[PDB]
Design an enzyme around this catalytic site. Sequence first.
Site, short mmCIF file in Angstrom:
data_model
loop_
_atom_site.label_atom_id
_atom_site.label_comp_id
_atom_site.label_asym_id
_atom_site.label_seq_id
_atom_site.Cartn_x
_atom_site.Cartn_y
_atom_site.Cartn_z
N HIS A 88 1.85 -7.55 10.55
CA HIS A 88 1.83 -6.10 10.35
C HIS A 88 2.46 -5.38 11.51
O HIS A 88 1.82 -4.59 12.21
CB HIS A 88 0.42 -5.60 10.06
CG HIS A 88 -0.17 -6.23 8.85
ND1 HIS A 88 -0.96 -7.35 8.92
CD2 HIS A 88 -0.06 -5.93 7.53
CE1 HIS A 88 -1.33 -7.70 7.70
NE2 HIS A 88 -0.80 -6.85 6.83
N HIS B 39 7.92 -5.88 9.56
CA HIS B 39 7.39 -5.74 8.22
C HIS B 39 7.60 -4.34 7.64
O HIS B 39 7.95 -4.19 6.46
CB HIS B 39 5.92 -6.12 8.19
CG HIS B 39 5.25 -5.77 6.92
ND1 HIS B 39 5.60 -6.33 5.71
CD2 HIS B 39 4.23 -4.90 6.65
CE1 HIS B 39 4.82 -5.82 4.76
NE2 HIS B 39 4.01 -4.94 5.30
N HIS C 25 3.61 2.83 6.58
CA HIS C 25 2.47 2.41 5.72
C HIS C 25 1.48 1.44 6.36
O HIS C 25 0.40 1.26 5.82
CB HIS C 25 2.99 1.81 4.40
CG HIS C 25 3.34 0.36 4.50
ND1 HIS C 25 4.54 -0.12 5.00
CD2 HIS C 25 2.60 -0.73 4.20
CE1 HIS C 25 4.50 -1.44 5.00
NE2 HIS C 25 3.33 -1.84 4.53
N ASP C 26 1.89 0.77 7.45
CA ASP C 26 1.02 -0.14 8.20
C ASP C 26 0.91 0.24 9.70
O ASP C 26 0.54 -0.58 10.51
CB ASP C 26 1.48 -1.60 8.05
CG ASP C 26 0.94 -2.30 6.77
OD1 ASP C 26 -0.21 -2.02 6.33
OD2 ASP C 26 1.67 -3.18 6.18
N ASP D 98 5.88 -3.75 -0.74
CA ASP D 98 4.93 -4.22 0.25
C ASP D 98 4.64 -5.73 0.15
O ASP D 98 4.39 -6.39 1.16
CB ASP D 98 3.64 -3.43 0.13
CG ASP D 98 2.71 -3.59 1.33
OD1 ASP D 98 3.17 -3.80 2.47
OD2 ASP D 98 1.47 -3.42 1.14
N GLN E 201 -0.81 -19.06 -1.43
CA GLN E 201 0.44 -18.50 -1.95
C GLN E 201 0.51 -18.59 -3.46
O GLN E 201 0.90 -17.63 -4.13
CB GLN E 201 1.65 -19.14 -1.31
CG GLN E 201 1.71 -18.96 0.19
CD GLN E 201 1.56 -17.50 0.61
OE1 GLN E 201 2.44 -16.69 0.36
NE2 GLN E 201 0.44 -17.18 1.29
N1 LIG Z 1 2.42 -14.00 0.93
C1 LIG Z 1 1.18 -13.50 0.94
N2 LIG Z 1 0.13 -14.34 0.79
C2 LIG Z 1 -1.11 -13.83 0.79
N3 LIG Z 1 -1.49 -12.56 0.90
C3 LIG Z 1 -0.43 -11.74 1.04
C4 LIG Z 1 0.89 -12.12 1.07
N4 LIG Z 1 1.71 -11.01 1.23
C5 LIG Z 1 0.88 -10.01 1.30
N5 LIG Z 1 -0.44 -10.37 1.20
C6 LIG Z 1 -1.58 -9.47 1.20
O1 LIG Z 1 -1.21 -8.29 0.52
C7 LIG Z 1 -1.69 -7.12 1.24
C8 LIG Z 1 -0.52 -6.36 1.81
O2 LIG Z 1 -1.02 -5.17 2.47
P1 LIG Z 1 -0.31 -4.60 3.82
O3 LIG Z 1 0.72 -5.64 4.21
O4 LIG Z 1 -1.46 -4.48 4.82
O5 LIG Z 1 0.33 -3.21 3.47
C9 LIG Z 1 -2.68 -7.68 2.26
O6 LIG Z 1 -3.97 -7.80 1.67
C10 LIG Z 1 -2.04 -9.03 2.59
O7 LIG Z 1 -2.93 -9.97 3.15
MG LIG Z 2 -1.25 -2.37 4.51
MN LIG Z 3 2.35 -3.76 4.41
#
Ligand SMILES: Nc1ncnc2c1ncn2[C@@H]1O[C@H](COP(=O)(O)O)[C@@H](O)[C@H]1O
Ligand SMILES: [Mg+2]
Ligand SMILES: [Mn+2]
Lengths: 366, 369
Positions: free
Chosen positions: A84, A88, A150-151, A264, A315
Amino acid sequence: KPILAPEPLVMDNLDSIMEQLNTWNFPIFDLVENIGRKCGRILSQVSYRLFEDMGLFEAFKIPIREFMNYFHALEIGYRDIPYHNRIHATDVLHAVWYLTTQPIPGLSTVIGGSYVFSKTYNVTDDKYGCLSGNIPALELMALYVAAAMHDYDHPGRTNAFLVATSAPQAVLYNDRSVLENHHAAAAWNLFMSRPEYNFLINLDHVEFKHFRFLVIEAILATDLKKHFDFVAKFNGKVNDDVGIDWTNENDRLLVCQMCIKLADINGPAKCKELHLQWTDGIVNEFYEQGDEEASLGLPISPFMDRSAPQLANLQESFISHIVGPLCNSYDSAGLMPGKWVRKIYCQITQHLLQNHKMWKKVIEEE
Amino acid sequence: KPILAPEPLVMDNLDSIMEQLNTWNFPIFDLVENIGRKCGRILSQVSYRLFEDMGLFEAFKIPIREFMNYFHALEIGYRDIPYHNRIHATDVLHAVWYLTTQPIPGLSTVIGSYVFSKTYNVTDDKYGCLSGNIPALELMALYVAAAMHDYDHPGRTNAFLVATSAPQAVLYNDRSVLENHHAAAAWNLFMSRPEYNFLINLDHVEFKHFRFLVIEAILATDLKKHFDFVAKFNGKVNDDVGIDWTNENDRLLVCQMCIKLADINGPAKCKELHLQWTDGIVNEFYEQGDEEASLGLPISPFMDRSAPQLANLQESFISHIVGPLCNSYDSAGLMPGKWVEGRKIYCQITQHLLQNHKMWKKVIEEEQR
Ligand SMILES: Nc1ncnc2c1ncn2[C@@H]1O[C@H](COP(=O)(O)O)[C@@H](O)[C@H]1O
Ligand SMILES: [Mg+2]
Ligand SMILES: [Mn+2]
Ligand SMILES: Nc1ncnc2c1ncn2[C@@H]1O[C@H](COP(=O)(O)O)[C@@H](O)[C@H]1O
Ligand SMILES: [Ca+2]
Ligand SMILES: [Mg+2]
Ligand SMILES: [Mn+2]
């Protein structure tokens, strides 16, 4: 003291990498190496290029210095954590730009006034449109700004961890979308803290209020606790008597929310090489959290135990439960970028299918 | 630094006014005078009595000292402003207790944990009460929510905070700005000191669920969500099962309607109480109007002291907000009341509301002639 944008505002040496922004599998990690890993300029440099590509600076008489001041301050407040981070944020911004500017087979478009178009949009075929032809420039700009924000100031912990530990932020936001409320609030606070950051100075008051509302709605849509609600709502609107009505502001908002949602979690819909690097990042954050959970005497959350990783299962289930249905919904609305090849070839869904098969195969061997 | 409950925890010379807590038109302003204005003790004193009336201290092995410590710190953080003060908190708490403990004609007790007021006779057969249908833990959350629900209110509306980009509006992204703050600041206060931990004998699961209920109740007091709550409630009442008291989500929705009604109870009290509360709210409005003008903003409707439309404000508040909420609550069959001897029910609450509505209508007629 304000954080001001560094050296000459626009970097000159990045031209050959920046020309490849019109690709889905943009080599973002090569751009990171080119700039320098902790240099803290990737988000502002990409943002400049995408805003210029869209003619948003002219459209809203945005002063470039203040724009770069703000996006630099913003990128500096993304922490040096494995996922994050500002890289990203840049990735998500690039993805919302691609999804909104790139040719979409058989989408009808308003123009082909209050709309803007990418310089990379070369198709003159009437059998292709783009979202930027259907969503006014103000609303598009809100989506892009939302993606950049956003993060912001992510601590490298999940909402459930913050809530379970009664973190000051969880108490502050009453356990509701803790991280997302924080991202939006801290980024907006940063924005209003200095006149050196006011790149929105030429929006009138009404425009500004509506812009702010759209940005917040987009950022808050990134909370996965609301994922199934957004998807059901979208599927409901797609399968009704008229479908998406581009003249209805609530329909447009919902489309933008699906866009930022897809942007995202785009990782599993990129080429193997990108998907795997991003995956490494997310699990390294999870493992740091797992270590903290253990040290606090809490049970280590699923998939966060470094000494018993279940990467492939994580995944695979993320794709089958979250990304897959989201892509299917978006694709069923006919909003996925793609090419006519009577049939349509869609790179994004092809990648997702390949990555899903790859993880399945790993699971079979284990 | 801990704010501690003062002297003997229970003040002893107020039993004549406190005995009247069982009356809807509780003379709360007389209690204020009896205690002392800005003594800062009304909320903790009434809280103690209502918790004791319900046997909640025994039910959750609540230590009284910590309970009084917390409710005193809480009441101290209600500001000395004309309406959103500790007196209003006390009033809302009394109202939720009345609504939940008092006989309700033809309400059935759930088939198959629960607490009852000392004012409730078990011999009520054609009557029931909400406390017989809502588990004690959830009832306690509702009471605590009422005590907390306007904590540290600044005397400005959400719309003003939002329009002026107040730090709180930015912090909460313009969404239920005040209500988020009330809940967050009250919970923060609670967690800041062990001297405040009156919930020490809830287990962790119970505590988490309690906290969730409190927040949901407080957040339900945002009037921007009023028509959503009312539509949802009316929807649940007019479907196949109606209210299902064994369903946790139905019970939550009932509690939210309860605290909503308790919060805007003023127009449904006697003229004396209604008019005093009304004076309070319009004084806050006028202070805001003055600030709006000085900031160069347009003065909000009904907030211009030099062109008041008090009667129109109260009439439209009753007809558009309180009236439909009471009708919805009444349609669920949840209004306290009595059977008319010699099919029909007499409901004091809706009678008061109707009388106050007629009063303001009459005032409107005089003004325009
Ligand atoms: N490749 C991935 N595998 C598992 N969880 C993911 C993956 N990509 C995104 N996430 C989850 O999706 C959400 C993305 O929210 P954010 O990146 O905080 O804006 C979070 O809960 C991440 O842990
Ligand atoms: Mg987020
Ligand atoms: Mn994000
Ligand atoms: N008598 C009244 N007349 C007009 N508005 C009222 C009255 N009583 C309560 N309200 C409104 O109800 C809102 C919710 O109540 P509270 O949570 O106590 O602020 C207040 O912000 C007021 O705007
Ligand atoms: Ca249909
Ligand atoms: Mg309130
Ligand atoms: Mn209130």
